[PDB]
Structures are given as structure tokens and as C-alpha cells.
């Protein structure tokens, strides 16, 4: 195949004869590794599809302990990029042929792609990602220089290009030097321009970077595995559904347009919040943090994650009207929504001897400033928890007459455990004093009915009334 096989023998030597960019991708692996076996096909495809551009090599660590030890390989597969013979960072990409070929092609420079013809230009901005294109008619411009500084600094997250082609330079600027940002055409929409022009008087790398960050996405980008790390982190509303612009472009726009429809109103009105649509499938693993069911239903589901970490989930179904989404946003901005918590239903009757706590009533029960609360966090499968159940139930009965002490329990696997508390193993028992709600103490004592009585008598806020017979 086109994959070079390096060894402790020829590594240092063969690792330097690189193609044009002095770049080489090296896969450190072991043939027994499952992930390594899975990548094999992809890596072979990538290698041949990069022939001439960037060479790909693989090192069998089981047979070459010295070279793997030298580059600190501790897991397989480990993909490292080498430049002119020295380590140059790990390959932070999907383990697919397409992922590898594209990343390395960009990596194989230039930071900014020169456009020599309108044909090359039209083709550059016909990509699925945005395009940052610089237009300069003067070869010695300081602006063109500042642009290249930006390209280098940001080439990791954006696609850069520049041109001096008479036509292009004329059409996109007056003064012979400007920067145009082109949003993917398949996301073109009646709610915002498809291109944004740089308008700062002076052109500096720093100002360019800020200009990029602030405009590439528009009011509602399509979040993909490729750009998620650029979109998440800030106050963000994500509408999840069947987003796929290859086989379902119509449906994709259909919903995205209704989302942006509402977004624009609140946005123009001054409210602050970022928006984005994303594949219910590509991010199915995130849907659980909002307690959202990924049904092939096709109808979108909405949920906000504040920069802090707060999670707000639209409960009402998505109306093709946008009114539902508009309502959810109104409440959100008016502070009317309750953050999302995984929780079992509040029990119909919760009358001792052991108070049943779930995430929804946790605050109400455990954090009632006027009470001492001993709470047991257990798991349905735990045997030691089953043995404590009866003994704990008795404790509750013996404390039934005390109006200051509450004996409670919560299934910690079926309910989010609030911040203060940390559930190590099972069972974890905490004691929350009447006026130390922020500082509950973890019960380290024995689990016999007598140990609990002894503990309470020694820690209760007010003298405890323990029924005795």
C-alpha cells in the first residue's frame, strides 16, 4: 500500500524525507487494538489519496518499543504529525479517510490560499464552510500582510484565501483592499446577508480575528462535529432535529428558517443569546443532558445551555408557527423557566417514616433551613443498601415524634444529586444541619440503628426526641 512502515531501525532517518510541506503523519499502534483495526482501512485510503502531498506512516509499537517510548505513546492509535522530523502536535481529527485527507491538505499550507482566476475563486467559496477572502491589488500592502498574520494564527479554525485578480478586487472593494466573509451558500437565507464586509478603518491581524469570530456564523449556524468547539460555551440555544444538507436539505431549511424567524425578533430587540441547529443523531449523546428523547419524530426539540451551565428545556412541542419557540424564549429572558433536572416524579403521598426525596423536591425537603436532615443516597442494585433499608426505616419511625429532624432517602441513580453533595459509592449518607445547608457533613459512622441514634443525639441541632421501646 501507500503507507510507509517505519521502525526503530529507519524512523529517525525516513521521518525527514517529507513531501513539499515537510509534513508526515505517523500512526503508532498495535495490531491487537480494536480501534487500530478499525482505522486501518481509512488510513490506507488516506495514504493513497494524499500521495505526493503528505506521506503517512505507521509504527507497530509491539515491535518497536524504542520509538514509541521516545514519543510517549501510551495508547493506540496515536496519530502524530511531524514537521521536518520533529513532533508537531497530535492529529486532533476524526479517524476517517475524509477527515485525515482534508486536515492534512489544509495543514500542508498555505495559511491563505491564493486565487488566480475567477474560476478558482468561485470554487473556493463553494465550500460547505465559510470563506474569509482578502482582496489586495498592491503586492507590498501592509494590510495584505496583516491578513496573512491572521491566516497563520487562525488557519486552524477558518478557511483563508486572497487574490489580486483585477475583476475580483474591483467587485469587492473600492480602495483596492478589503476582506469579505462568505457564509456557506446552502445556508443562504432571507434573514441575513450571505456575505459580510470588514469595515474597520485600519486592517490589523487582531481586528481581523475579532471580525471573523463575530460574524462567521450569522444569527443561527449549523453546528457540526467540526465547528462545535467554536459554537458551544456561551449562552446557546440549540434546536435538534434531522439536520442533513445532503439528503434532507429541504427539511433542514424548513426548520432552521422557523428558528431564525423567532431568533431575529428577540435579537433585533436587543436580547443576548446565540442560536444554532444540530443533528439529533450526530449529537444524540448530548440529548440526555437535557433529558430529551431522540425519536425519529423529525420534529425539532429545543434546549438552552447558559455559559454558566444552566440548562433550560422547551417542554411545549415545536409549533410550525414559531409561537411555541417564541413563548419559551420570552419566559427564558423573563426568568420564568425552571432549570432542567433529571428527576423521578414527586410521590403522591410522602408521609414518613422516611421522607422520599427526588431531585424536584430536594431543595424543599433537604434544604428546609428549620430542620436537621439526615439523607441517605442509595442505588436500586446495592445489596448493602437493601440491608440498611429496614434499619433506616426504623430510625425514621423512632424519630417520628421529633419536629426538627427529618430522615430521608433518595435514589441517587434516578435523580440528579445537587451540587453541595457528592455521591461516592452506595450508600452515601449525609447530615444537613438546620443552619449549615451549604455545609452538610458526610456520615462516616456505622450503619446500625444504634449508630444512627448515637450520631443524632450527638449532632442534632436541638435535643432530639427519640421514641424509646
Amino acid at each position: 500500500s501507500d503507507v510507509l512502515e517505519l521502525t526503530d531501525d529507519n524512523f529517525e532517518s525516513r521521518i525527514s524525507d517529507t513531501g513539499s510541506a515537510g509534513l508526515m503523519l505517523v500512526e503508532f499502534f498495535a495490531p491487537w487494538c480494536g480501534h487500530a483495526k478499525r482505522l486501518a482501512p481509512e488510513y490506507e485510503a488516506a495514504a493513497t489519496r494524499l500521495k505526493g502531498i503528505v506521506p503517512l506512516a505507521k509504527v507497530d509499537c509491539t515491535a518497536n518499543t524504542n520509538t514509541c517510548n521516545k514519543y510517549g505513546v501510551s495508547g493506540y492509535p496515536t496519530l502524530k504529525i511531524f514537521r521536518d522530523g520533529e513532533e508537531a502536535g497530535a492529529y486532533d481529527g476524526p479517524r476517517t479517510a475524509d477527515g485525515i485527507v482534508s486536515h492534512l491538505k489544509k495543514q500542508a499550507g498555505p495559511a491563505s490560499v491564493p486565487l488566480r482566476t475567477e474560476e478558482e475563486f468561485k470554487k473556493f467559496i463553494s465550500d460547505k464552510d465559510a470563506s474569509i477572502v482578502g482582496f489586495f491589488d498592491d503586492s507590498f500592502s501592509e494590510a495584505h500582510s496583516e491578513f496573512l498574520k491572521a491566516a497563520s494564527n487562525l488557519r486552524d479554525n477558518y478557511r483563508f484565501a486572497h487574490t489580486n485578480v483585477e475583476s475580483l478586487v474591483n467587485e469587492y472593494d473600492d480602495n483596492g483592499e478589503g476582506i469579505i466573509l462568505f457564509r456557506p451558500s446552502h445556508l443562504t437565507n432571507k434573514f441575513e446577508d450571505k456575505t459580510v464586509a470588514y469595515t474597520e478603518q485600519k486592517m490589523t491581524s487582531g481586528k481581523i480575528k475579532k471580525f471573523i469570530q463575530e460574524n462567521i456564523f450569522g444569527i443561527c449556524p449549523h453546528m457540526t462535529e467540526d465547528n462545535k468547539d467554536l459554537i458551544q460555551g456561551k449562552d446557546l440555544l440549540i434546536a435538534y432535529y434531522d439536520v442533513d444538507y445532503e439528503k434532507n436539505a429541504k427539511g433542514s431549511n424548513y426548520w432552521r428558517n422557523r428558528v431564525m424567524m423567532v431568533a431575529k425578533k428577540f435579537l433585533d430587540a436587543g436580547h443576548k443569546l446565540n442560536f444554532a441547529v444540530a443533528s439529533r443523531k450526530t449529537f444524540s449523546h448530548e440529548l440526555s443532558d437535557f433529558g430529551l428523547e431522540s425519536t425519529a419524530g423529525e420534529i425539532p426539540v429545543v434546549a438552552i445551555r447558559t455559559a454558566k451551565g444552566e440548562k433550560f428545556v422547551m417542554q411545549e412541542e415545536f409549533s410550525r408557527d414559531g409561537k411555541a419557540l417564541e413563548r419559551f424564549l420570552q419566559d427564558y429572558f423573563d426568568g420564568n423557566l425552571k432549570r432542567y433536572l433529571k428527576s423521578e416524579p414527586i410521590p403522591e403521598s410522602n408521609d414518613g417514616p422516611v421522607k422520599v426525596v427526588v431531585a424536584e423536591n430536594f431543595d424543599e425537603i433537604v434544604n428546609n433551613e428549620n430542620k436537621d436532615v439526615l439523607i441517605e443516597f442509595y442505588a436500586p442494585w446495592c445489596g448493602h443498601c437493601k440491608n440498611l433499608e429496614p434499619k433506616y426505616k426504623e430510625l425514621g419511625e423512632k424519630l417520628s415524634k421529633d419536629p426538627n429532624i427529618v430522615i430521608a432517602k433518595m435514589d441517587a441513580t434516578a435523580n440528579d444529586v445537587p451540587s453541595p453533595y457528592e455521591v461516592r459509592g452506595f450508600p452515601t449518607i449525609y447530615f444537613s444541619p438546620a443552619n449549615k445547608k451549604l455545609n452538610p457533613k458526610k456520615y462516616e459512622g456505622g450503619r446500625e440503628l444504634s449508630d444512627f441514634i448515637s450520631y443524632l443525639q450527638r449532632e442534632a441541632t436541638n435535643p432530639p426526641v427519640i421514641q424509646e421501646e
Binding site: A36, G75, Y76, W381, G383
Partner: protein, 361 residues
């Protein structure tokens, strides 16, 4: 207990485990000198009943790999294989009526050795059960014993998170009864049939090796829970499995009707006797014998008269009942004081059976 264990390597080839006697008859890449840091494998056979048959042993090539079930994925967050697991592995399966054990060994690359030609191997994970053929009384709780031991790579906190899974299997159809990954809060499959488990590390010492518990607690066992149980312990990329064969049983309560007989004149026939054989399991193997004790012919003679059996009666708990009947012949005066009795035999009963009697007048 045993010093060596004859074993079969499959993919058979003869092999052996030495818990050094030369063995030209073996490979010796299949002749293993066992180093067991955690100690569970060696401790299991140190207790082995003397004179007990040789346990069955199977050896095979093992390849570390993430657990397939998604609930266990938490044990393997990073998407890459640990280098510490390079090198070959052998999985050892040992079973007998005393115990059922599974072990993951790491043999040295080459056999060679100064004293004798044998291959050094190290025990990494041991999963063991001292109740391989449990017999629980119907309606009672069953405690399927399970212990394990893990030796971490000395190539580099306390004991790591691990996974435990219990299932009842029948005809390639397995039902997950319990699953857990103590030390790693995750979404576990629902525990079934009220089962729970004492799944935990015996201690949390700094570097290890460590031993742990995973015994299964199945409440009020019924006949439908009878069968093959598989228990698996999970460690990143490593798993050990043992098999238990659970049998349910219930001895029968035996009683007669009438409970006592009135006085009767010779040539007169006593009332039909009913021998109730109540709530027993399994249904088969129940035998009814009628006897005449303390009579003009030894205190044990087979009774005469007409006898028959009722059909089986099936209860909700899966146990069964049945009735034996005997119509004794007209009573003789030389039978006065003798007793009619029904001797019940059932595999869940002693050799002498269980009886019930009534005295004649």
C-alpha cells in the same frame, strides 16, 4: 490442594498450570508457572477439598477489548487501547462441583528457564464462585457467591471502577438481571426480579492488588428462576466470566386422612386413606409406598388393598401437590394396634423417605 492442574488449550493441545517438575510431554508454551499477586487463584486451590476429583480446565487465547454492552462504556472513556496491555493473554476456565473460576494470565514471550523448561505467567484478573451448583429452597432467598481479584499494571489512586453483570441464560437467550459499575456513576440497566448485589472492592488500599465481592442476592426464588446464571466482572478492556447452575427444590409435607381411626369389628374395612403429599418440587421422582407397620408380619410389610394416585395439582409458586389413596382390606383382630402408613420418596428427601401413619383399632 492440587499442585498442578492438567489443562486443555483450545482455539485440543495438552497443557498444565503449576500452582519445577519437568514435562517433556507438554509444549512448554502451555506449561505455566503461575505467579498470582492478588492471590485469589492460588487461595482457591489451597482450600480445594482433598481427594476431590481433578477440576476441569480449559485454556485459550484472550484479546483485551472494550466490553460490548453500552452500559459498561463508562469504564473505557478514552477512545484508545492502553499500552500497558501489550503482550499476549490466556484465559483460564476452571470448573468443578466445588468451584467455578475464570482467570486472565499473561505468559512470558519465551518458555526458557535455568532450572526447568517452563513458561512464566502472571495472573491479572481472577473471577471466582464457591457456589457453582447452588440448591435453594423454593420461596427462599438465593445468595450466589462471587469474588474477584485484580492486579494492576505495575508500569502505571485506589482501586479503579469496575463492572459487574449477572444474567440468567437459556437457549442462547440471556436475560440481564443486574448490572453495576461501582465507582463510576452511570446509567445502569434496571435490576430485575428484585435482585441486588454486594458489588464492591474489599478495601481501598493505595496501590493494590485488590480483591472484591459481587455476590448476587435473588429474593424468594421460584422454579422459573431455575437454570444457568452467568456472572461477569469488567475492568477496562478485561472481563472474566463464571457459570452457576441454580436448582430449586422443596421437600413434601406428608400427612394422612383420617388422621386417626375409630374402633372397628373384624371383617370390616377401614375408610379410604388419603396420603397428602403437599407442596414439593420438582414434580418428578415422587413415589408413594403404602405399608402396614407393627403387624402379624414384621413392623414393615407392604400394605394390601386398592391404591391409586391423584393427578398433579399445580400451585402458583411452581410447586406441586398430589394424593395417594389406599382402600385397606377388612381388618383382622391380629392387626389391632398396627399402623397403616404411606412412605414417600423424593430426590429432595433422605434415603428413608418421609412417612405418615394411622393406628387401627
Amino acid at each position: 490442594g492440587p499442585a498442578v492442574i492438567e489443562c486443555w488449550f483450545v482455539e485440543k493441545r495438552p497443557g498444565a498450570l503449576l500452582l519445577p517438575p519437568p514435562r517433556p510431554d507438554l509444549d512448554p508454551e502451555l506449561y505455566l508457572s503461575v505467579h498470582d499477586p492478588a492471590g485469589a487463584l492460588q487461595a482457591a486451590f489451597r482450600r480445594y477439598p482433598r481427594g476431590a476429583p481433578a477440576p476441569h480446565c480449559e485454556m485459550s487465547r484472550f484479546v483485551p477489548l472494550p466490553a460490548s454492552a453500552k452500559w459498561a462504556s463508562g469504564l473505557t472513556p478514552a477512545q484508545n487501547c492502553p499500552r500497558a496491555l501489550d503482550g499476549a493473554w490466556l484465559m483460564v476456565s476452571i470448573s468443578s462441583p466445588v468451584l467455578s473460576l475464570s482467570s486472565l494470565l499473561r505468559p512470558q514471550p519465551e518458555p526458557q528457564q535455568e532450572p526447568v523448561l517452563i513458561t512464566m505467567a502472571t495472573v491479572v484478573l481472577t473471577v471466582l464462585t464457591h457456589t457453582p451448583a447452588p440448591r435453594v429452597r423454593l420461596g427462599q432467598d438465593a445468595l450466589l457467591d462471587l469474588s474477584f481479584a485484580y492486579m494492576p499494571p505495575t508500569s502505571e489512586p485506589g482501586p479503579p471502577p469496575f463492572g459487574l453483570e449477572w444474567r440468567r441464560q437459556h437457549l442462547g437467550k440471556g436475560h440481564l438481571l443486574l448490572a453495576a459499575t461501582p465507582g463510576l456513576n452511570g446509567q445502569m440497566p434496571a435490576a430485575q426480579e428484585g435482585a441486588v448485589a454486594f458489588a464492591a472492592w474489599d478495601d481501598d488500599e493505595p496501590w493494590g492488588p485488590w480483591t472484591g465481592n459481587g455476590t448476587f442476592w435473588l429474593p424468594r426464588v421460584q422454579p422459573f428462576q431455575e437454570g444457568t446464571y452467568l456472572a461477569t466482572i469488567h475492568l477496562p478492556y478485561l472481563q472474566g466470566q463464571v457459570t452457576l447452575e441454580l436448582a430449586v427444590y422443596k421437600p413434601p409435607k406428608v400427612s394422612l386422612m383420617p388422621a386417626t381411626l375409630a374402633r372397628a369389628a373384624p371383617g370390616e374395612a377401614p375408610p379410604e386413606l388419603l396420603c397428602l403429599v403437599s407442596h414439593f418440587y420438582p414434580s418428578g421422582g415422587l413415589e408413594v409406598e403404602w405399608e402396614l407397620r407393627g403387624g402379624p408380619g414384621g413392623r414393615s410389610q407392604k400394605a394390601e388393598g386398592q391404591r391409586w394416585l391423584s393427578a398433579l395439582r399445580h400451585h402458583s409458586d411452581g410447586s406441586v401437590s398430589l394424593s395417594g389413596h389406599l382402600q385397606p382390606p377388612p381388618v383382622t383382630t391380629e392387626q389391632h394396634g398396627a399402623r397403616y402408613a404411606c412412605r414417600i420418596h423424593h430426590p429432595s428427601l433422605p434415603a428413608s423417605g418421609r412417612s405418615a401413619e394411622v393406628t387401627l383399632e
